[PDB]
Design a binder for these strands. Structure first.
Ligand SMILES: [Mg+2]
Ligand SMILES: [Mg+2]
Ligand SMILES: [Mg+2]
Ligand SMILES: [Mg+2]
Ligand SMILES: [Mg+2]
Ligand SMILES: [Mg+2]
Ligand SMILES: [Mg+2]
Ligand SMILES: [Mg+2]
Ligand SMILES: [Mg+2]
Ligand SMILES: [Mg+2]
Ligand SMILES: [Mg+2]
Ligand SMILES: [Mg+2]
Ligand SMILES: [Mg+2]
Ligand SMILES: [Mg+2]
Ligand SMILES: [Mg+2]
Ligand SMILES: [Mg+2]
Ligand SMILES: [Mg+2]
Ligand SMILES: [Mg+2]
Ligand SMILES: [Mg+2]
Ligand SMILES: [Mg+2]
Ligand SMILES: [Mg+2]
Ligand SMILES: [Mg+2]
Ligand SMILES: [Mg+2]
Ligand SMILES: [Mg+2]
Ligand SMILES: [Mg+2]
Ligand SMILES: [Mg+2]
Ligand SMILES: [Mg+2]
Ligand SMILES: [Mg+2]
Ligand SMILES: [Mg+2]
Ligand SMILES: [Mg+2]
Ligand SMILES: [Mg+2]
Ligand SMILES: [Mg+2]
Ligand SMILES: [Mg+2]
Ligand SMILES: [Mg+2]
Ligand SMILES: [Mg+2]
Ligand SMILES: [Mg+2]
Ligand SMILES: [Mg+2]
Ligand SMILES: [Mg+2]
Ligand SMILES: [Mg+2]
Ligand SMILES: [Mg+2]
Ligand SMILES: [Mg+2]
Ligand SMILES: [Mg+2]
Ligand SMILES: [Mg+2]
Ligand SMILES: [Mg+2]
Ligand SMILES: [Mg+2]
Ligand SMILES: [Mg+2]
Ligand SMILES: [Mg+2]
Ligand SMILES: [Mg+2]
Ligand SMILES: [Mg+2]
Ligand SMILES: [Mg+2]
Ligand SMILES: [Mg+2]
Ligand SMILES: [Mg+2]
Ligand SMILES: [Mg+2]
Ligand SMILES: [Mg+2]
Ligand SMILES: [Mg+2]
Ligand SMILES: [Mg+2]
Ligand SMILES: [Mg+2]
Ligand SMILES: [Mg+2]
Ligand SMILES: [Mg+2]
Ligand SMILES: [Mg+2]
Ligand SMILES: [Mg+2]
Ligand SMILES: [Mg+2]
Ligand SMILES: [Mg+2]
Ligand SMILES: [Mg+2]
Ligand SMILES: [Mg+2]
Ligand SMILES: [Mg+2]
Ligand SMILES: [Mg+2]
Ligand SMILES: [Mg+2]
Ligand SMILES: [Mg+2]
Ligand SMILES: [Mg+2]
Ligand SMILES: [Mg+2]
Ligand SMILES: [Mg+2]
Ligand SMILES: [Mg+2]
Ligand SMILES: [Mg+2]
Ligand SMILES: [Mg+2]
Ligand SMILES: [Mg+2]
Ligand SMILES: [Mg+2]
Ligand SMILES: [Mg+2]
Ligand SMILES: [Mg+2]
Ligand SMILES: [Mg+2]
Ligand SMILES: [Mg+2]
Ligand SMILES: [Mg+2]
Ligand SMILES: [Mg+2]
Ligand SMILES: [Mg+2]
Ligand SMILES: [Mg+2]
Ligand SMILES: [Mg+2]
Ligand SMILES: [Mg+2]
Ligand SMILES: [Mg+2]
Ligand SMILES: [Mg+2]
Ligand SMILES: [Mg+2]
Ligand SMILES: [Mg+2]
Ligand SMILES: [Mg+2]
Ligand SMILES: [Mg+2]
Ligand SMILES: [Mg+2]
Ligand SMILES: [Mg+2]
Ligand SMILES: [Mg+2]
Ligand SMILES: [Mg+2]
Ligand SMILES: [Mg+2]
Ligand SMILES: [Mg+2]
Ligand SMILES: [Mg+2]
Ligand SMILES: [Mg+2]
Ligand SMILES: [Mg+2]
Ligand SMILES: [Mg+2]
Ligand SMILES: [Mg+2]
Ligand SMILES: [Mg+2]
Ligand SMILES: [Mg+2]
Ligand SMILES: [Mg+2]
Ligand SMILES: [Mg+2]
Ligand SMILES: [Mg+2]
Ligand SMILES: [Mg+2]
Ligand SMILES: [Mg+2]
Ligand SMILES: [Mg+2]
Ligand SMILES: [Mg+2]
Ligand SMILES: [Mg+2]
Ligand SMILES: [Mg+2]
Ligand SMILES: [Mg+2]
Ligand SMILES: [Mg+2]
Ligand SMILES: [Mg+2]
Ligand SMILES: [Mg+2]
Ligand SMILES: [Mg+2]
Ligand SMILES: [Mg+2]
Ligand SMILES: [Mg+2]
Ligand SMILES: [Mg+2]
Lengths: 137, 52, 154, 117, 112, 101
RNA sequence: GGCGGUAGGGGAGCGUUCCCGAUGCCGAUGAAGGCCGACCCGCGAGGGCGGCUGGAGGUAAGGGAAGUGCGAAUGCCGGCA
RNA sequence: GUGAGGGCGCGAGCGAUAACGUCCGCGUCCGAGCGCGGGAACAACCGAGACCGCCAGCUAAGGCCCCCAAGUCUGGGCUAA
RNA sequence: AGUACCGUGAGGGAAAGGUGAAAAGAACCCCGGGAGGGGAGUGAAAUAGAGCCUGAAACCGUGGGCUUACAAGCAGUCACGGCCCCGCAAGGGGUUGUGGCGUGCCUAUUGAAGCAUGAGCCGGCGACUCACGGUCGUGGGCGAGCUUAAGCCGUUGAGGC
């Protein structure tokens, strides 16, 4: 019978974001967000690595984007389709730009939301100096 | 019989759920100056009496 | 549905009623109503070919005989209708009662004998029927009765 | 010769009724709703059966892929080397070696490395 | 050890007395008595009268001391309903269902 | 000593003498059969050809016997078509013995 | 080697009520039926066994005759939501 | 049993070189394969005809960055919307 | 019971059986206005206590095990795990947290999950027959023949003429 994994300790990770293509980054962030990279994978349990990203604003993006990209925020109210350009996001709370990205890439499942928590993002760097900090690229 | 008509037979599960807060609440009583009988707060009582 | 006390009136107008739709209560789908295709009285008999009638009676007597149970008899010391006598005869005949016997004799007194006896069945000479025959273990009949038997088939 | 409905029906009912015992409200009390439930479920089993295969197929590959990937190469790369080295040995299932006796998996990877060229 | 006491055939809707019962579910005799004494319900009258006799049986038939018995359990049950007629507009008849109740109250010895 | 072995179209590892359950086979009740089909070992038995050359895994057929009766059943809608077919698979209780490669 | 399948045709079987088998046989050391089951046999419909209820009937092997199996008919009667 | 057929490709009438339009013909699928994979979902488009089992194995269509199985493959060009 | 009831009237027309071998059908005491229970006594049995044998289903209820308030669904199904429960073990049973997949039944249709039909839920009733004749198949008898009809004799679930 296929291997039956058990309780695994949260392996944290420290990832950069300077001059990084928004997408190309988020992909890995998601890939590694779930333990999909560890051969001992298991969809049921949800034991992904705690991914922390720094230097959010630094993120690079191609073509028009900055001026082109548009985000959709629909409140339940009439004409509440309030929409925001990319730049604006980088102005207000830039961290979002990557969040909503990874967010949209994690499985739609309820444990995916649980994986969203394993995702901490800021721009400084300077993370909440806890313990783990395995840098990567 | 008119326009107001239920669409489906409310599942016996939802029924009970509805009657959630339906439960009662025990009365309020306290010992009295006369006997040990439990009078309702701010009240006299039969087979007990009062003053003033 | 015909022979039932119920009326012939229609229960509802079958229109703007909201109800199903019917005529009278005599309808089978009206618990108590007329039986749908209930069996009415009728004969179950027919006319089986005479040849076969005899052919059977032959093969019948012949079977129990072939096995070795067709004991032809004659000496009936059973003076009257007194069971004791019969069982006393059968005893000295080879009928200890371990085998059901079909007794075919002309004498109506011999009837009386095995008439009540449980493990035996009395029967007229012409009474020879393929059922009772292949219904017992032993067949024992009066020689004279074997004569009339030879008449129908010999 | 009438033939009372007698017992047959009730038995046929309570029979199936129990096979479905455990479902939802009327879905597991009403003779019939249960049947309907069972009708679907019965089919679910058949499809989910052929699904059970597909499940582990990829499921394993996930482990395997991420496994050799840790040694640095593609699953497509991995397998090709094996299929070329002529070794049905590591049937996808038993590639779980990445968990049990990882060294074994390593050599298999090594073999795959030199397999291609 | 326990002392039962059931009042079958009581003109009243179970749902209504159910509330009463649930109040004294597992309470000291005196504790329950007080609840019924001042509680504002019609179901009180009945639940009381039965609960009371329940103690009487506990004592005079099961050597149980009044001062040491509570409510091990208790429940009400639905009995045969009295269907009736109800004149209605445009000549419609509807069956009003005055249900009945079987109030089962049981006591028991406390602890040690 | 992880020695793999393919039989009945399916393969799996084999602990040094342990209770196993495999596809039904044509062998005596309590006898012993050899499965030359062997893949790898405990000390890295690189399977040169698809199946290792000179190697063999031998076990004792602890017997036969059917198993859990799964219940298949098809049903298509809007059409009076319903099938209820009962089925159970047979097997052998191959009690692993010798794992000599 | 064939085996998706509605209208269809064809083939085999299961269970229900009664009949011969019955002046028999099973049965208060418990009949029919009801309740439970992860055991047994059958592809299956069903059959069997075990515990519990139940309180007097039941009926093989092999045959025979049918008021013979319901989920729906705004179907019928009743009971309950 | 059937005598409402339908979609589709192709060849024609009608239509307006309109219609999930319509009327014949050749074939095809759906019908009855609403069973499976693909196409986001989707009777008829692409793949392929389900006797049952299996935690085996190659492949079809499509696909191989994340939701998602499997290349952010290899090499050479074009396109800044 | 042609009763009850419905209809001016002609007429229509129900539902409704069962304690136990025996009434031995529950004395006395306890709570209670009573109904009803509780103990005692009867009986083989009182979940046989009186519209009382058996006593199923829907349906209402009490106690326990498992489960649930960041969740999106034809309600299941496949897998994994945790909880609880039977077995020495392997194993099995009850429950569902997470992941995968997933458009109810019948009818009617070219085509339905369909915002087309029917169904509140359960239990009981309910629909391809019978007679005569025809036709094809079939088993058996007899064969250039085969067969009787009404009826008569017999019997009292005998056949024969
Ligand atoms: Mg600019
Ligand atoms: Mg600018
Ligand atoms: Mg405005
Ligand atoms: Mg505004
Ligand atoms: Mg879901
Ligand atoms: Mg409830
Ligand atoms: Mg309450
Ligand atoms: Mg008439
Ligand atoms: Mg009449
Ligand atoms: Mg009349
Ligand atoms: Mg009439
Ligand atoms: Mg009439
Ligand atoms: Mg008429
Ligand atoms: Mg008329
Ligand atoms: Mg009309
Ligand atoms: Mg009738
Ligand atoms: Mg009648
Ligand atoms: Mg009648
Ligand atoms: Mg006739
Ligand atoms: Mg006839
Ligand atoms: Mg005839
Ligand atoms: Mg006699
Ligand atoms: Mg019936
Ligand atoms: Mg049925
Ligand atoms: Mg279950
Ligand atoms: Mg396959
Ligand atoms: Mg590893
Ligand atoms: Mg009053
Ligand atoms: Mg007393
Ligand atoms: Mg009652
Ligand atoms: Mg009014
Ligand atoms: Mg009502
Ligand atoms: Mg060796
Ligand atoms: Mg077929
Ligand atoms: Mg075919
Ligand atoms: Mg048959
Ligand atoms: Mg008899
Ligand atoms: Mg019977
Ligand atoms: Mg029985
Ligand atoms: Mg069974
Ligand atoms: Mg038994
Ligand atoms: Mg008994
Ligand atoms: Mg029994
Ligand atoms: Mg009989
Ligand atoms: Mg009938
Ligand atoms: Mg049906
Ligand atoms: Mg109905
Ligand atoms: Mg209606
Ligand atoms: Mg209605
Ligand atoms: Mg009704
Ligand atoms: Mg026509
Ligand atoms: Mg054209
Ligand atoms: Mg048209
Ligand atoms: Mg058209
Ligand atoms: Mg066509
Ligand atoms: Mg077809
Ligand atoms: Mg076809
Ligand atoms: Mg076809
Ligand atoms: Mg469907
Ligand atoms: Mg698809
Ligand atoms: Mg499809
Ligand atoms: Mg196969
Ligand atoms: Mg392949
Ligand atoms: Mg391709
Ligand atoms: Mg993709
Ligand atoms: Mg290029
Ligand atoms: Mg009496
Ligand atoms: Mg009394
Ligand atoms: Mg009383
Ligand atoms: Mg009284
Ligand atoms: Mg009294
Ligand atoms: Mg009693
Ligand atoms: Mg009982
Ligand atoms: Mg009794
Ligand atoms: Mg009683
Ligand atoms: Mg009386
Ligand atoms: Mg009563
Ligand atoms: Mg009773
Ligand atoms: Mg009775
Ligand atoms: Mg009796
Ligand atoms: Mg009961
Ligand atoms: Mg009762
Ligand atoms: Mg409760
Ligand atoms: Mg509860
Ligand atoms: Mg409970
Ligand atoms: Mg939120
Ligand atoms: Mg929670
Ligand atoms: Mg969903
Ligand atoms: Mg325990
Ligand atoms: Mg134990
Ligand atoms: Mg144990
Ligand atoms: Mg175990
Ligand atoms: Mg276990
Ligand atoms: Mg378990
Ligand atoms: Mg379990
Ligand atoms: Mg359980
Ligand atoms: Mg869904
Ligand atoms: Mg219609
Ligand atoms: Mg239509
Ligand atoms: Mg059609
Ligand atoms: Mg709907
Ligand atoms: Mg509908
Ligand atoms: Mg409509
Ligand atoms: Mg219509
Ligand atoms: Mg309706
Ligand atoms: Mg209604
Ligand atoms: Mg109704
Ligand atoms: Mg109704
Ligand atoms: Mg029903
Ligand atoms: Mg019904
Ligand atoms: Mg019927
Ligand atoms: Mg019928
Ligand atoms: Mg005829
Ligand atoms: Mg002709
Ligand atoms: Mg003929
Ligand atoms: Mg003929
Ligand atoms: Mg012939
Ligand atoms: Mg012939
Ligand atoms: Mg012949
Ligand atoms: Mg012939
Ligand atoms: Mg012949
Ligand atoms: Mg006689
Ligand atoms: Mg008779």
């Amino acid at each position: 019978k296929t291997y039956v994994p058990k309780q695994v300790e949260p392996r944290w990770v420290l990832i950069d974001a300077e001059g990084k293509t928004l997408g190309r980054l988020a992909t890995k962030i998601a890939t590694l967000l779930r333990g999909k990279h560890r051969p001992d994978w298991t969809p049921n349990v949800a034991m992904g690595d705690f991914v922390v990203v720094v230097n959010a604003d630094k993120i690079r993006v191609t073509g028009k984007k900055l001026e082109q990209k548009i985000y959709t925020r629909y409140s339940g109210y009439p004409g509440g389709l309030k929409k925001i350009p990319l730049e604006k996001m980088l102005a207000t709370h830039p961290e979002r730009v990557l969040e909503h990205a990874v967010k949209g890439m994690l499985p739609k499942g309820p444990l995916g939301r649980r994986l969203f928590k394993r995702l901490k993002v800021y721009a400084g760097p300077d993370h909440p100096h806890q313990a783990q900090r395995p840098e990567k690229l | 019989a008119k326009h107001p008509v239920p669409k489906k037979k409310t599942s016996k599960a939802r029924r009970d759920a509805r009657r959630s807060h339906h439960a009662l609440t025990p009365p309020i009583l306290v010992p009295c100056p006369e006997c040990k009988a439990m009078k309702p707060p701010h009240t006299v009582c039969p087979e007990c009496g009062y003053y003033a | 549905r015909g022979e039932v006390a119920y009326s012939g009136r229609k229960i509802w107008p079958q229109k703007h009623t909201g109800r199903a739709r019917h005529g009278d209560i005599g309808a089978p789908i009206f618990v108590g109503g007329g039986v749908v295709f209930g069996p009415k009285p009728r004969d179950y008999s027919y006319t089986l070919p005479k040849k076969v009638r005899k052919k059977g009676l032959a093969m019948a007597v012949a079977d129990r005989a072939r096995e070795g149970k067709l004991l032809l008899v004659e000496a009936f010391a059973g003076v009257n209708g007194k069971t004791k006598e019969f069982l006393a005869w059968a005893k000295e005949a080879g009928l200890d009662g371990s085998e059901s016997v079909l007794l075919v004799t002309g004498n109506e007194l011999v009837r009386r004998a095995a008439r009540n006896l449980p493990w035996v069945v009395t029967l007229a000479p012409e009474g020879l029927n393929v059922y009772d025959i292949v219904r017992t273990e032993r067949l024992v009949m009066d020689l004279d009765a074997w004569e009339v038997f030879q008449n129908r088939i010999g | 010769p009438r033939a009372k409905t007698g017992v047959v029906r009730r038995r046929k009912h309570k029979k199936i009724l129990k096979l479905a015992k455990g479902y939802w409200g009327l879905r597991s009390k009403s003779f019939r709703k249960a049947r309907e439930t069972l009708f679907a479920a019965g089919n679910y089993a058949y499809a989910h059966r052929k699904r059970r295969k597909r499940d582990f197929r990829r499921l394993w590959i996930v482990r395997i892929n991420a496994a050799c990937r840790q040694h640095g190469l593609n699953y497509s790369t991995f397998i090709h080397g094996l299929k070329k080295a002529g070794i049905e040995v590591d049937r996808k299932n038993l590639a779980d070696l990445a968990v049990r006796e990882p060294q074994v998996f390593a050599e298999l990877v090594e073999r795959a490395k030199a397999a291609q060229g | 050890m326990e002392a039962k006491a059931i009042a079958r055939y009581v003109r009243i809707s179970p749902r209504k007395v159910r509330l009463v019962v649930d109040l004294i579910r597992g309470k000291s005799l005196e504790e329950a008595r007080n609840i019924l004494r001042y509680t504002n319900k019609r179901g009180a009258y009945f639940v009381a009268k039965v609960l009371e006799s329940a103690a009487a049986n506990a004592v005079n038939n099961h050597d149980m001391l009044e001062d040491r018995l509570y409510v091990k359990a208790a429940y009400v049950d639905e009995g045969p309903a009295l269907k009736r007629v109800l004149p209605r507009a445009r000549g419609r008849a509807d069956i009003i269902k005055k249900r009945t109740s079987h109030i089962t109250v049981i006591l028991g010895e406390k602890h040690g | 000593m992880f020695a793999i072995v393919k039989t009945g179209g399916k393969q799996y590892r084999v602990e040094p003498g342990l209770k196993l359950r495999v596809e039904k086979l044509d062998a005596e009740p309590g006898a012993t059969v050899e499965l030359p089909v062997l893949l790898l070992g405990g000390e890295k038995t690189v399977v040169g050809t698809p199946v290792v050359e000179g190697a063999s895994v031998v076990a004792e057929v602890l017997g036969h016997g059917r198993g859990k009766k799964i219940l298949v059943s098809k049903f298509k809608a809007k059409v009076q078509y319903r099938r209820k077919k009962g089925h159970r698979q047979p097997y052998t209780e191959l009690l692993i013995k010798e794992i000599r490669g």
